[PDB]
Amino acid sequence: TTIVGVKFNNGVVIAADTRSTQGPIVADKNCAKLHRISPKIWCAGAGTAADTEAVTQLIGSNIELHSLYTSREPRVVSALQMLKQHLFKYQGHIGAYLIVAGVDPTGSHLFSIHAHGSTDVGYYLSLGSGSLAAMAVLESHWKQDLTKEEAIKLASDAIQAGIWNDLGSGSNVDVCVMEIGKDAEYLRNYLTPNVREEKQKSYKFPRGTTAVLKESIVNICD
């Protein structure tokens, strides 16, 4: 997994690859590592798939309830605090590593959370096995005051660094843009640089090839 976060002049953008693995086997060639905690608070998750998903939905659900109760837009710090305290309560047993970003009444925010519960703040961040490939790009091309377009390119380039150099990463690049005054824009499969080439032959079998022993209809209607 390669996920990153990058702040630009008027917002924050996050990206991620789309590979899932079980040992050396690709479990899912196109899963979505970008989760919505609230309309304008998005989260990029790495680590144990089910854990990032579950913790992301739980806090998202509580954020919605809190929002409704306070009649206020959710704040990125609230998600950050609820997540970290949860992860800490579990002494790192919940294998979630996340980059949480978003825009709220107080501005744009970029944070990261580790399985044990520590959080960090920055203008650019990366997590996952592709963490280093991505960070090398970020450490090489990030500058203060980037435009929405520059940020997307940088983030997207960082993800590619992981897709190409990290066996734990690959496939596509997902992105989500959160700009201070607009709706967040989720760009699922913003990049698809790994389309499988046309197969050499069709393996469609001639009907009757398979030996059947018995047959029957199944009742679905009650």
Partner: protein
């Protein structure tokens, strides 16, 4: 990590490097290890980022509630809440914390809370993996009631040496000055302190 707190004529100054590692990888090169638990009571964190963050967050909550009920808490009281948390949970924490605060009557105060959970009030204290390398330097260069400038220099020199020898320390040097005048944040860069 390299952290320290020094009392001087006008109050106290906290200092720290900005490196957080996961093995030999620098997870963060611009970490802020100087954390505020009250207007004029801060702390330097070392050990587990997750553990010290969780403890500081709780101490801050306790002091906020304390203030709501009985007014401003002393630096001693803050060092006591930290200590209570660290001692009572010693089996599940890895937090080496330095507590520093400025008081009008006591001026500057420093309390170090090492791994076991004991408390130690001192003129200054050093901690973190980088501290070992500057025990002699600091013991030979510390003086009581130095001036703000002499103290900033002592901390800048001490920590540059700690950063020099400890791979777990590095990045920029951060400082927080606490006096009757208020709260001043200081930052020093490699180009400046490396050549001291």
């Amino acid at each position: 990590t390299s952290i320290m707190a020094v009392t001087f004529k006008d109050g106290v100054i906290l200092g720290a490097d900005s490196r957080t590692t996961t093995g030999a990888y620098i997870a963060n090169r611009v970490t802020d290890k100087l954390t505020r638990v009250h207007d004029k009571i801060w702390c330097c964190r070392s050990g587990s980022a997750a553990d010290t963050q969780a403890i500081a967050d709780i101490v801050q909550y306790h002091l906020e509630l304390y203030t709501s009920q009985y007014g401003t808490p002393s630096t001693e009281t803050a060092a006591s809440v930290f200590k209570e948390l660290c001692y009572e949970n010693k089996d599940n924490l890895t937090a080496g914390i330095i507590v520093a605060g400025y008081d009008d009557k006591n001026k500057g105060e420093v309390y170090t809370i090492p791994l076991g959970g004991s408390v130690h009030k001192l003129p200054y204290a050093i901690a973190g993996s980088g501290s070992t390398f500057i025990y002699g330097y600091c013991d030979k260069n510390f003086r009581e009631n130095m001036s703000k400038e002499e103290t900033v220099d002592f901390i800048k020199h001490s920590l540059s040496q700690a950063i020099k020898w400890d791979g777990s320390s590095g990045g920029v040097i951060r400082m927080v000055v606490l006096t009757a005048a208020g709260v001043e944040r200081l930052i020093f860069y490699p180009d400046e302190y490396e050549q001291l």
